[PDB]
Design a protein around this ligand. Structure first.
Ligand code: CLA
Ligand code: CLA
Ligand code: CLA
Ligand code: CLA
Ligand code: CLA
Ligand code: CLA
Ligand code: CLA
Ligand code: CLA
Ligand SMILES: CCCCCCCCCCCCCCCC(=O)OC[C@H](COP(=O)(O)OC[C@@H](O)CO)OC(=O)CCCCCCCCCCCCCCC
Ligand SMILES: CC1=C(C/C=C(\C)CCC[C@H](C)CCC[C@H](C)CCCC(C)C)C(=O)c2ccccc2C1=O
Ligand SMILES: CC1=C(C/C=C(\C)CCC[C@H](C)CCC[C@H](C)CCCC(C)C)C(=O)c2ccccc2C1=O
Ligand SMILES: [Ca+2]
Ligand SMILES: [Cl-]
Lengths: 40, 69, 146, 750, 70, 80
């Protein structure tokens, strides 16, 4: 139903989903290529 | 309440100058003074700055004569 | 901040140890430790259970400034109405105490206004901010070099 | 929803069939529970007010029968949350710890139940705790509990976590069931006599009964082998003891007789495992489990008997209404009349009692666990001891102020003056000024005659005048009463306790028990430095009580505000008039009492942490001498503020600032982080929103300049919310600082 | 066990029986029958009867274990 | 004593008088609004300045203004 599709798309749920996704991006990038004080 | 007004308190509240019956403004603070420097001497009897010298009974006297002032 | 900067870098220059400042001032723990905690040793040792040296007056003024600075927090955090109620309770207490209601007051006691509250709190904060840092700056300097 | 049969058998059961249907359309509608918020957000404050009133069910609906059905399912959901959290600990002990590696050599290794993912340098946080394991050394004392419970394999903790998750699912399901399928009426609730009978006889009685049975069949026969020197892999399983009752009959002489003597009043024969030794265990440093099983059996019998005092359906029993209406003397007029009706209708009236008692009991838990260590090897783990003590201090400290909050809530929302005519509450409301002014005087007295002593000692030691101090080497302030009761508890096993073999705790006086190379518990000599700090504690608690009491005795009205009851519980003020009416509500009084609870516990935990390190804890020599950490300077240095500034703070904070580059670096990070949050709170606590709204005006103009202003108009936090964020960040920063400091200091003492 | 029942346990049961037949407010208000005429076990409802039967076990334990150990 | 003024932007809704807790404000018949009334402040001697009127004003910015002044026993809200 749409009542739960609207709850999954609320401000806090989405603003935490984006933060989790960006955390995953940054964590994996600094896992495979860590220690980038600058660009070579 | 009993503490505020009882048998002994009804008279004793009314027994010191500003409640005492017909006491002159000369004696306006007899007790209010006879009870001051007599108990101010207590803390200076065994605890004062000069409690372990030879004037154990002098610092209290002078301090009381100043605190009463 | 400015005075921490000046004092730490000048300690480094005076002791010939500019390396300490140039290599610790980049992270805050360097300030919290190599400056605040490190240079306080003599300061807090002005009066000890073992003796009393010339820094004792500064060791007393440090805690004094802390006390005044913390006293300002009362006026700045709690506001008037609480104190007006607490004062009214005391007014009732005096006007009902035998051998004391006969001690009447011309000035009706009231709590400090909000403007006066902020002013007194800021004044205590400023006194405890200046005196404490001065007792640190003079004591920690008159030890390693004074 | 679903449709079960009935589930009743001539009971007071009363439910409503499907009152609230199950749907998701209300999930996409935030703030629907409030009429003022359902029309849509027009300012950003609408968002904050959404969370500030999420659980306040009085402002939502006025029907109490709906509020109670909400509260029941809320408790079920909380229990589901708790079971999830506990299954977390059991699973992390099963697969992310070294409980097996610690149980083997408990004196040569440290407990650890967390593994940090090696990434961006944080893999350094995995400290070598011993035995090849790398992780964070825990301080919650879970390995000691799991050893005292009989856990020996990882599969046991795994199944415990599985059962915890199952119970979480069950509580979560029961919550939905008791609000969407068959929600109970009011007839099922207001049986406080019946509820007390059931909560005493069944919950607290049968609980300790079953746990004592567990200990007799699991904990005792396995900890007896653990304390002997037997390897855990050679120790049998708990069910092998019931499958072979002869192995239990032999391991305890009393067990070699059968079950009949218990039924035939032959209790004295079971003295071979239901013991009364007391003291501690010289092998583990904790309490004897043979005594704890007996203790739980006694508590079980006592509670089951207590659950048979009140009246239910068979005529016998008491009615608390009768007991309250009976108690009345010439001093209080009608006495407790109307109190049953107070506590059977107002939920806040009940919570203001339950929170107070639960917080006090948490504090008692801390004070009893620290001195009579009930878990093996916890008295040697100084970190775990300190952590449990301080954590159960803080939990109780918060739960106590909760009582002073909900009391004022009851006063403003549920106090009916017609229902309280010349009873305890009504007559207490009369002489409010008397009690408040007397407590004012008492607080002033305790402030002068406890802290002024420290100021005088600092000024005397600063002036170079040792013979004028309040110390153990000058004007002594010896605590006679506490030392006397210490000596009383010391002479207990040979006078007022012939059956007791050892004292309740070795802190009062007696022998010095030590495990491995560290001490477990020794007599805590009380002198001047203890008397002064005890009076400091009393003063701080008195001021906190004064604040939280004037918060309730004046939530209705006052000489300043006579119509305060109209303003509600939570409100900032009543205008700058009357000289200034800022912070008069009960909400503001709780906001102020939070700070004083923090300030009191800040001295309590420091008293604990320094007295233990100075006059108790310390390494023991093989000849017999005991050398304390701070060399016993508490009795000679804790008497001045400079002593606490230098020899306590400055001296013992070195472990935290020098923690960079090690496994304790996170503690220094959090130390500075709490120092940050503390100061961040001062911005809110010292300012007012009238400036921030004027600034938001300029930022709104800037946003509209590029046409980027949200339709949700931005509004600065309300005055109440400003104060709330201030106090929240103050407490958070302070407690994070003290937590980091205490953990980094306790882990660095060996 | 040879005489622990009649001398104390039955004695304490009957003691609680008397003090409950005389002191309990609501006796016959219980759910049980108490139909047959007995000395003191079914003269009033078995709620009251079982109440004193439990309290008499309490008293009997407190007296037997209070005599001399076990 | 405090000063209480009422401006011509007042719509005469009596809300500030319904919120006043010291009978400081009244309502006199006017000729400016539909209600044909405007707020009045005859008994400024009883005005403590709790701003309960200004809080209960509907017009764009206040139509009634309170300006705190020389505080007295009555304006200070002294009950002792
Ligand atoms: C707000 C200023 C700021 C800036 C400019 C940087 C910049 C940087 N940080 Mg950093 N960081 C910051 C704040 C900042 N940080 C704060 C406040 C923290 C505490 C949480 C951290 C904690 C942190 C860690 C733990 C690490 C970095 C790392 C890095 C570097 C990795 C760049 C990268 O991932 O490649 C490009 C990314 C996408 C293309 C980079 C130069 C990494 C490093 O190794 O430094 C060299 C790394 O390990 N930062
Ligand atoms: C409430 C805290 C407190 C207490 C209990 C004391 C107590 C004492 N102080 Mg003291 N003092 C304090 C705070 C306190 N002080 C503070 C805050 C300072 C400033 C930092 C000082 C500075 C100070 C100095 C410089 C000296 C003392 C001295 C003394 C002793 C004698 C003073 C005396 O008897 O006068 C009279 C007391 C009374 C009249 C009390 C009457 C009130 C009734 C009972 C109510 C005494 C035991 C003197 C001493 O002899 O050294 C031992 C001394 O030299 N004090
Ligand atoms: C999928 C099952 C389900 C569904 C569809 C609903 C649907 C509804 N419930 Mg409901 N409820 C459920 C399960 C469910 N509930 C359970 C299991 C419980 C027991 C805790 C409750 C207890 C409950 C109460 C007391 C009330 C409702 C109410 C409502 C209605 C409004 C809910 C709302 O405000 O928005 C949605 C709300 C949220 C999404 C809250 C988010 C979750 C919070 C922040 C924390 C989650 C805690 C959780 C219960 C336990 C944690 C799980 C564990 C793994 C940690 C709505 C139609 C209210 C009502 O009837 O309106 C008057 C009402 O008062 N429910
Ligand atoms: C012997 C039967 C029995 C038992 C074992 C329990 C047990 C419990 N009841 Mg309960 N209760 C009972 C009978 C019983 N009740 C009866 C007969 C009534 C009606 C008078 C109630 C009415 C009642 C209410 C209103 C509430 C409880 C609650 C609770 C839980 C609170 C304790 C807790 O959270 O700690 C830990 C839990 C597990 C370790 C607990 C598990 C509270 C609760 O949690 O809500 C569901 C609650 O608010 N009970
Ligand atoms: C089981 C105990 C209990 C229960 C059931 C309640 C229940 C209630 N309380 Mg209450 N309270 C309690 C204990 C309890 N309280 C205690 C111990 C205190 C002392 C601190 C208070 C102080 C208190 C106040 C001052 C108020 C209430 C209010 C309320 C009512 C509304 C709750 C609310 O505002 O929504 C939801 C609650 C929130 C949105 C708070 C969120 C902010 C939290 C505190 C942040 C904490 C951060 C986190 C824990 C740690 C930091 C990590 C971070 C980095 C993420 C509600 C019925 C309010 C009321 O109006 O009463 C009717 C009210 O103003 N309570
Ligand atoms: C170093 C700072 C400092 C100092 C010296 C004081 C001192 C005092 N406070 Mg205080 N307070 C402070 C910070 C401070 N406070 C802060 C930051 C807050 C905000 C939470 C408060 C909030 C507060 C409240 C709410 C109350 C006090 C009270 C008191 C007085 C109690 C009487 C006494 O102690 O006996 C002797 C005097 C000195 C030892 C006392 C003079 C209480 C009072 O008025 O007395 C009954 C009172 O109710 N304070
Ligand atoms: C350590 C205490 C502290 C801190 C951090 C601040 C910080 C700030 N003050 Mg401030 N102030 C303080 C104490 C403090 N103040 C005190 C005691 C007073 C006297 C009452 C004032 C009075 C004051 C005034 C009058 C003003 C400020 C202003 C500002 C802001 C200026 C903008 C800036 O610095 O850029 C950047 C911001 C920061 C560096 C701070 C943000 C730090 C966080 C950690 C960033 C990350 C966000 C975080 C992850 C959020 C997630 C939380 C999650 C865990 C729940 C800033 C946020 C001015 C302002 O509003 O700006 C326009 C302003 O006019 N302050
Ligand atoms: C009327 C005969 C009788 C006698 C002679 C005693 C004698 C005694 N009882 Mg006892 N008791 C009795 C009836 C009696 N009881 C009854 C009827 C009950 C049930 C209410 C109890 C319940 C009871 C308890 C709970 C305890 C005693 C205890 C004791 C001993 C006291 C230990 C002490 O001084 O401390 C003592 C020898 C204490 C004990 O066990 O000593 C170790 C104790 O804890 N009794
Ligand atoms: C640390 C203690 C060692 C120092 C000694 C201090 C002596 C304390 C004074 C004696 C107790 C006074 C209370 C009983 C006196 C008592 O409760 O009598 C009973 C009386 C009412 O009883 P009724 O006759 O109405 O009984 C009917 C009731 O069931 C209710 O209707 O209560 C009051 O007196 C009200 C006045 C309270 C105000 C006095 C209390 C003083 C506050 C400080 C108390 C200190 C206690 C410290 C304990 C840790
Ligand atoms: C304690 C307190 C009071 C009560 C304070 C009172 C009643 C003042 C009492 C202080 C007396 C007068 C002694 C002060 C001693 C000073 C050092 C004397 C300085 C005066 C100069 C002339 C020297 C408030 O009124 C108040 C108002 C708003 C916010 C916070 C607070 C607040 O915290
Ligand atoms: C700064 C300040 C404000 C303004 C404060 C504001 C506008 C709060 C800012 C909140 C921002 C918009 C959200 C950021 C904080 C979030 C709650 C953190 C959530 C982060 C997750 C999404 C990860 C007041 O309103 C105020 C009121 C009364 C006294 C003092 C003050 C005061 O000092
Ligand atoms: Ca001397
Ligand atoms: Cl010192």
């Amino acid at each position: 139903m749409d009542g739960l599709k609207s709850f999954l798309s609320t401000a806090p749920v989405m603003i935490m989903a984006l933060l989790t996704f960006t955390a995953g991006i940054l964590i994996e990038f600094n896992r495979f290529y860590p220690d980038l004080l600058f660009h070579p | 309440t009993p503490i505020s007004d009882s048998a002994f308190t009804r008279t004793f509240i009314g027994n010191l100058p500003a409640y005492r019956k017909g006491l002159s403004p000369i004696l306006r603070g007899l007790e209010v003074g006879m009870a001051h420097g007599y108990f101010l001497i207590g803390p200076w009897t065994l605890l004062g700055p000069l409690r372990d010298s030879e004037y154990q009974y002098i610092g209290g006297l002078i301090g009381a004569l100043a605190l009463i002032l | 901040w400015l005075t921490f900067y000046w004092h730490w870098k000048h300690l480094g220059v005076w002791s010939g140890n500019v390396a300490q400042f140039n290599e610790n001032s980049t992270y805050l723990m360097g300030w919290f430790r190599d400056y605040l905690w490190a240079n306080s040793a003599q300061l807090i040792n002005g009066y000890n259970p073992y003796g009393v040296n010339n820094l004792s007056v500064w060791a007393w003024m440090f805690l004094f400034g802390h006390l005044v600075w913390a006293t300002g927090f009362m006026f700045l955090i709690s506001w008037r109405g609480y104190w007006q109620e607490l004062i009214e309770t005391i007014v009732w207490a005096h006007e009902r105490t035998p051998l004391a209601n006969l001690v009447r007051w011309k000035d009706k006691p009231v709590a400090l206004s909000i403007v006066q509250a902020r002013l007194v709190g800021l004044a205590h904060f400023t006194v405890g901010y200046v005196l404490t840092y001065a007792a640190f700056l003079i004591a920690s300097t008159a030890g390693k070099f004074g | 929803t679903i449709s079960p049969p009935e589930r009743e058998a001539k009971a007071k059961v009363s439910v409503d069939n499907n009152p609230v249907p199950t749907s998701f359309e209300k999930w996409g509608k935030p703030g629907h529970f409030d009429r003022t918020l359902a029309r849509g957000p027009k300012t950003t404050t609408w968002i904050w007010n959404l969370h500030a009133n999420a659980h306040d069910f009085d402002s939502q609906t006025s029907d109490l029968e709906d509020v109670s059905r909400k509260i029941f399912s809320a408790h079920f959901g909380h229990l589901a949350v708790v079971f999830v959290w506990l299954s977390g600990m059991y699973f992390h002990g099963a697969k992310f710890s070294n409980y097996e590696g610690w149980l083997a050599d408990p004196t040569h290794i440290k407990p650890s139940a967390q593994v940090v993912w090696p990434i961006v340098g944080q893999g350094i946080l995995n400290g070598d705790v011993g035995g090849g394991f790398h992780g964070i050394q825990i301080t919650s004392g879970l390995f000691y509990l799991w050893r005292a419970s009989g856990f020996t394999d990882s599969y046991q903790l795994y199944c415990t976590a599985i059962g915890g998750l199952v119970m979480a699912a069950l509580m979560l399901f029961a919550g939905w069931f008791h609000y969407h399928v068959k929600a109970p009426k009011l007839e099922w609730f207001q049986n406080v006599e019946s509820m007390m009978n059931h909560h005493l006889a069944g919950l607290l009685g049968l609980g300790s009964l079953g746990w004592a049975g567990h200990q007799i069949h699991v904990s005792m026969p396995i900890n007896k082998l653990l304390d002997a020197g037997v390897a855990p892999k050679d120790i049998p399983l708990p069910h092998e003891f019931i499958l072979e009752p002869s192995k239990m009959a032999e391991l305890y002489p009393s067990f070699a007789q059968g079950l009949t003597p218990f039924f035939t009043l032959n209790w004295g024969v079971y003295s071979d495992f239901l013991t009364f030794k007391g003291g501690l265990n010289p092998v583990t440093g904790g309490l004897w489990l043979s005594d704890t099983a007996h203790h739980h059996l006694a508590i079980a019998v006592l509670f089951i008997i207590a659950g048979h005092m009140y009246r239910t359906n068979w005529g016998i029993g008491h009615s608390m209404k009768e007991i309250l209406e009976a108690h009345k003397g010439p001093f209080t007029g009608e006495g407790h009349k109307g109190l049953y009706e107070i506590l059977t209708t107002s939920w806040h009236a009940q919570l203001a009692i339950n929170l107070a008692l639960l917080g006090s009991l948490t504090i008692i838990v801390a004070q009893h666990m620290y001195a009579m260590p009930p878990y093996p090897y916890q008295a040697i783990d100084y970190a775990t001891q300190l952590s449990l003590f301080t954590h159960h201090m803080w939990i109780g400290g918060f739960l106590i102020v909760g009582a002073g909050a909900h009391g004022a809530i009851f006063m403003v929302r549920d106090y009916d003056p017609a229902k309280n005519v010349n009873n305890l509450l009504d007559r207490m409301l009369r002489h409010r000024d008397a009690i408040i002014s007397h407590l004012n005087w008492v607080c002033i007295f305790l402030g002068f005659h406890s802290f002024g002593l420290y100021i005088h000692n600092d000024t005397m030691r600063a002036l170079g005048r040792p013979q004028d101090m309040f110390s153990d080497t000058a004007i002594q302030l010896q605590p006679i009463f506490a030392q006397w009761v210490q000596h009383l508890h010391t002479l207990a096993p040979g006078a007022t306790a012939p059956n007791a073999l050892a004292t309740a705790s070795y802190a009062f006086g007696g022998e010095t028990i030590a495990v491995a190379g560290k001490v477990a518990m020794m007599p805590i000599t009380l002198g001047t430095a203890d008397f002064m700090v005890h009076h400091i504690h009393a003063f701080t608690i008195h001021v906190t009580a004064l604040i939280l009491l004037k918060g309730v005795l004046y939530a209705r009205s006052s000489r300043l505000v006579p119509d305060k009851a109209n303003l509600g519980f939570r409100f900032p003020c009543d205008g700058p008039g009357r000289g200034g009416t800022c912070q008069v509500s009960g909400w503001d009084h709780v906001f102020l009492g939070l700070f004083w609870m923090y300030n009191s516990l800040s001295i309590v935990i420091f008293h604990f942490s320094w007295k233990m390190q100075s006059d108790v804890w310390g390494t023991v020599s093989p000849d017999g001498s005991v050398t304390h950490v701070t060399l016993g300077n508490f009795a000679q240095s804790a008497i001045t503020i400079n002593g606490w500034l230098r020899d306590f703070l400055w001296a013992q904070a070195a472990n935290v600032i020098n923690s960079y580059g090690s496994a304790l670096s996170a503690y220094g990070i959090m130390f500075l982080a709490g120092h940050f949050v503390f100061a961040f709170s001062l911005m809110f606590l010292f300012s007012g929103r009238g400036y921030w709204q004027e600034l938001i005006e300029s930022i709104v103009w800037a946003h509209n300049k590029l046409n980027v202003a949200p339709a949700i108009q931005p509004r600065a936090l309300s005055i109440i919310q400003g104060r709330a964020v201030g106090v929240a960040h103050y407490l958070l920063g302070g407690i994070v600082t003290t937590w980091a400091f205490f953990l980094a200091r306790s882990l660095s003492i060996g | 066990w040879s005489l622990s029942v009649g001398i104390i346990m039955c004695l304490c049961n009957v003691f609680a029986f008397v003090i409950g037949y005389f002191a309990i407010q609501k006796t016959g208000k219980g759910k049980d029958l108490a139909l047959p005429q007995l000395a003191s076990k079914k003269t009033f409802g078995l709620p009251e009867l079982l109440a004193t039967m439990s309290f008499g076990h309490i008293l009997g334990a407190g007296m037997v274990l209070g005599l001399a150990s076990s | 004593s405090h000063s209480v003024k009422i401006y011509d932007t007042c719509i005469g809704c009596t809300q500030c008088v319904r919120a006043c807790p010291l009978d400081v404000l009244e309502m006199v018949p006017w000729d400016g609004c539909k209600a044909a009334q405007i707020a009045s402040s005859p008994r400024t001697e009883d005005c403590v300045g709790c701003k309960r009127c200004e809080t209960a004003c509907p017009t764009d910015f206040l139509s009634i203004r309170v300006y705190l002044g020389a505080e007295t026993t009555r304006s200070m809200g002294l009950a002792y």
